[PDB]
Symmetry: D2
Subunit: 330 residues, 4 copies
């Protein structure tokens, strides 16, 4: 058996070392944008990365281009870092209009970086936008800032795609763009063709969604601009290696992409805090290749017949037969 | 101080005795629709009930009209019982087309009952519609049945309002109409003016929503047809007496209704399994009256100024000053 | 390859038809204890059942013995129905002392049934014991009733084992015996050798525990009297077919049982509400047989070496190699 | 009315600025230990702080003593920082024995600081101890390291109390000392009189416990060495200002402390990321003073009568009458 595997990608931050409110001295040394690209190269199966912007201090666009070329990598997305201290109280939704304007300027500049690097989208994740307490915000006004600010950004760059990465929460207690459905509602309201969704399987999962259903819902609106995969224990954005907890639902997610003829980079968004980051990516790709092989074995017509009958026993037996196929025989 | 309190209502089932998968012999004796109306009368401050339909065996529409009249109650909604054994595998989404048709006939008949009783809406809660396992359903086809079937029902009855009561889950592992945002998306797809939302505070809460924000979002689309209140511990539809766990967030919910000038019956949807059902309703009304008085005391301009600043400490101080006002000074 | 598979069992209720607060007319017709035993026979690989007591109306102990014999089944446990209407406000913890006494009498009688049927244990699940609201109970006095009442029961029957099935909640908002750790604390307080634990994988899972760790903790105290398995989405006791959502963690559970040489019936506690109940049990057994074969393939020494290093990437690689082995190569 | 209010305290980190994996440049400038003590002074009602150890770079014990004296503050606890990069893979449970030894040395030194400052306890919070993936650890061996390491520490310092702050998780996916009950089990196993519990109301709440019950359970074992309060939305350690979400359950927690004659510092453990930290503490103390006044008004005999009857309606009516007393009338 021979397979034409999907192209794989990762957020560049898969190869950064992290920091949290406890290990304030970091989970390893600070790595530059260039160090992170060199790390992604070591994985040996990636074709794309999503690069945060601005790059680390001192790193230029020319240096990034060179590192990417030497790594055999292309930029799939550019993620403006609209969640740093400057925007700790919001980017689109900062109470300070000057802060909102500065956020726009960074995101607008990031669309230029997308043009320069031939990336697919500006990946918009406004992590500091939302609320921490009941009564902290006017719900009407907060959501208006979110939607209007997004429209302003996208409207100023009609030639570039903006992929909104919804997330239930973190760092806020509740984020503005919190679910697939609310994101699609917001997209309707914005009214622009160049705004779509970055569907993070893990975000959907711990948000209580069926990630497979969310993929279908978004695809049905023509708004699935990209995906991210990882795993978690359904309570938080744990950002674990894909396939280590929820094999079945991850398989369902890829099944829905398959039947909808949705082609895209299979993209990792994972944070291997305490692990070898390169090896974490490698294990992830091994599992994803298994998923690809399992999709080939899956008896789709039999599954769909079971689904028409809504017989979960038949559906699960068919799915297990494909998924519980040998990973060690590739 | 003197107050013109809101009109209060309850689901008629607030006065039924329940049954679950363990206490299969029930939490008390079976009470007829008429017995339930007579119990609702005992509360002493209800003006409306939402009546399940069909009525209990042998009970006629004429008997119901007489009992409601004598009890000082009007029907605010009629809830077709589309979640009984016949539709245990779905109403709109049953795999058997004949079952789907039969559900339509009942719901269509319930629209007639709404006309006869002058009720505001058919209250649509398709509790058996959804899935229990990953891979059990075609998500595309399941949602299409849900939306198309709702359109068929509402389109056949343009003079009657249909309020969709979204709910995360139960009795299914996941219900079709599972959130405010998805419901609004579905309403846009249906494309009819007579379809709206029954927002149950408790469903929003355990669904991970800000109930206040959901109210605002729905009101912004002109689709808030009614409300249900209760409390829970945010993990399940516990259907506890309102104000016993989450006083702050229920106050926020009513605050949003107030600032939008949303006028409508303050409706209880509670299941006092092991309590005196009449006294549970009475305690709920006492709390709602406190909420109403607290809303009158609330410094709304100062709150809104704090919200513009997104200062949660100022917002909470103002809220606490109103909410912690004496309940024994009525 | 040839395997000596574990003996399989199920709660007899795996073959009952259910009822809930919505489908009050049931998910199917009422089946007698004898009908349930006859259905269990159909599965074709069960050796044991756990029987609720009292049996359904009119069914005698002699009839049960004959049906079990003819079905090829033995009683592994007897479950006194201490959660029916009589005890809807508690069994051990009922506020009415006469109700507490009546619960004792039933449980004491069930110990006799265990003697008569040669079962391993009285399976104690005090589902109605706990609380629904903050402030409803004296936590000190509630827990004292729970512990002292359990001591009274077990102390009166020193020759019989009592397996306490802990569970987070349902039908109460919180149950007394709510976790592995609390149960072990209670067992230490009771101070009797014949009180242990029925560890339900699904209860542990939606309770936020690592079921594997709970198994180890209980085994370390010599208190693992039996197991129940099923699956869920980690928010509720969904009681789905085992292996349909959390294959990795159920494999870990059985792995812990294996390395501790815990020998005991692999017991299903599942509620196939809307499915063919016999085929649900069959699919469950097929999966458990896969688990057994996967445990034989698992490189336990390499896993344990990875665990000493706390390297999750190595651990998961090893686990996946075993678990993803072919299910259709039996 | 005149009140002798409880002594108030806060973790010193209530006055630090924070950092997370997104705002890696921090939520404000780095404040030294001394700056934080000066901040605590500004609150104007604190008597105690819990100080992390080591102090910030360059800060000496002599300087801390001087700052504390000038602030009118005493050290209630010392928190060894066993969750920094060095111990990012565990303190007691690090796979590297050298790391475990270094953790012991820091904690042992911190017991000396407790002696010097006359603090009540070494506050032990081993945040990096636990696991991130299923199968990552030997559950038996991991828990053995946790218990044995704690015994080694406490046994080496029999004159000093060690308060274990249990927490469900964060930064790990699951922490070793994860619940009140498991902590009490561990304490039994350690077998030393100087090991007890720091009960964080928020940790109990998002762990699914009744914080009030947990307080009772721990007090019944004589192990409640201290408390921490804050609030959250039950899904995560949000560390919000106390009383902003769950007034009722916080009241219940203090009620249980009251009836058990448990006297201690009312201690805040909150992280006002985006707020004025001093004002956050001030609002907290205002709410806690309200709680104290409400406890004075509470009709405890009537409540306890309701609790004996397990009547939650009566219990809640009595509680509301006390809690919903005017906060603005002190
Ligand atoms: Cl698409
Ligand atoms: Cl409206
Ligand atoms: Cl054992
Ligand atoms: Cl104590
Ligand atoms: Fe992502
Ligand atoms: Fe993520
Ligand atoms: Fe409702
Ligand atoms: Fe409900
Ligand atoms: Fe069970
Ligand atoms: Fe169960
Ligand atoms: Fe704390
Ligand atoms: Fe905390
Ligand atoms: Mg094919
Ligand atoms: Mg049609
Ligand atoms: Mg006694
Ligand atoms: Mg007094």
């Amino acid at each position: 058996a021979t397979y034409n595997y999907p192209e794989f990608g990762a957020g560049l931050w898969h190869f950064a070392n992290y920091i949290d409110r406890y290990a304030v001295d970091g989970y390893g040394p600070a790595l530059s944008t260039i160090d992170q690209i060199n790390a992604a190269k070591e994985v040996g199966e990636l074709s794309y990365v999503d690069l945060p912007y601005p790059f680390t201090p001192g790193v230029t666009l020319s240096e990034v281009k060179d590192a990417l070329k030497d790594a055999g990598l292309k930029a799939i997305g550019i993620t403006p870092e609209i969640y740093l201290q400057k925007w700790s109280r919001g980017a689109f939704t900062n109470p300070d209009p000057a802060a909102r304007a500065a956020a726009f300027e960074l995101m607008h500049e990031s669309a230029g970086i997308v043009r320069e690097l031939g990336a697919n989208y500006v990946k918009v994740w406004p992590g500091q936008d939302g609320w921490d307490y009941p009564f902290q915000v006017s719900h009407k006004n907060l959501w208006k800032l979110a939607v209007d600010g997004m429209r302003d950004l996208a409207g100023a760059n009609p030639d570039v795609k903006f992929a909104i990465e919804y997330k239930p929460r973190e760092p806020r207690v509740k984020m503005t763009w919190d679910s697939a459905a609310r994101t699609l509602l917001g997209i309707e309201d914005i009214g622009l063709d160049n705004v779509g969704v970055l569907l993070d399987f893990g975000h959907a999962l711990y948000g209580g969604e069926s990630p497979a259903d969310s993929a279908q819902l978004i695809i049905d609106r023509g708004r699935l601009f990209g995906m991210d995969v990882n795993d978690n224990l359904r309570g938080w954005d744990d950002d674990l290696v894909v396939g280590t907890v929820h094999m079945t639902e991850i398989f369902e997610f890829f099944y829905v992409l398959k039947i909808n003829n949705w082609q895209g980079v299979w993209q990792l968004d994972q944070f291997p805090f305490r692990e070898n980051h390169v090896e974490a990516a490698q294990l992830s790709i091994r599992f994803l290749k298994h998923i690809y092989r399992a999709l080939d074995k899956l008896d789709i017509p039999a599954l769909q017949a079971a689904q028409e009958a809504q017989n979960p026993l038949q559906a699960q037996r068919i799915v297990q037969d494909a998924l519980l196929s040998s990973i060690t025989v590739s």
